[PDB]
């Protein structure tokens, strides 16, 4: 599953025509596009590799 969530503050004067406003005109833009399942799990580093990345010298 994919979750696309948006949050922000919109001035009720930049809304143009068909109730549409570009995200660049929204203050406090919070945009999340996350996924689940093994497809998302395959994009995680892995505990040992993450530890080496954060601690291993060079």
């Amino acid at each position: 599953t994919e979750f696309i969530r948006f949050s922000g503050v919109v001035n009720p004067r930049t809304i143009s025509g068909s109730n549409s406003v570009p995200s660049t005109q929204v203050a406090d833009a919070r945009i999340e596009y996350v996924g689940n399942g093994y497809i998302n799990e395959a994009q995680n580093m892995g505990w040992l590799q993450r530890f080496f990345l954060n601690l291993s010298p060079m």
């Binding site: 503050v9 001035n11 004067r13 660049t24 005109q25 203050a27």
Partner: protein, 58 residues
């Protein structure tokens, strides 16, 4: 809200809660160069390979 709002003005932000759009378009570039050189060359020679009898003393 009971506040006064002009009709013909450009709707600039005026209060604490007002929102404004910022276009970064930042571009800075600085460069610096310097060089110096100094060359001196000298080379002197002198030789008879044949000396007159009267000059053999010197």
């Amino acid at each position: 809200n009971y506040g006064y709002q002009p009709l013909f003005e450009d709707r600039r932000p005026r209060n604490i809660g007002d929102t404004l759009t910022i276009v970064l378009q930042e571009n800075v570039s600085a460069s610096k160069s310097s060089s110096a050189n100094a060359s001196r060359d000298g080379k002197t020679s002198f030789g008879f390979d044949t000396v007159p009898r009267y000059l053999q003393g010197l």
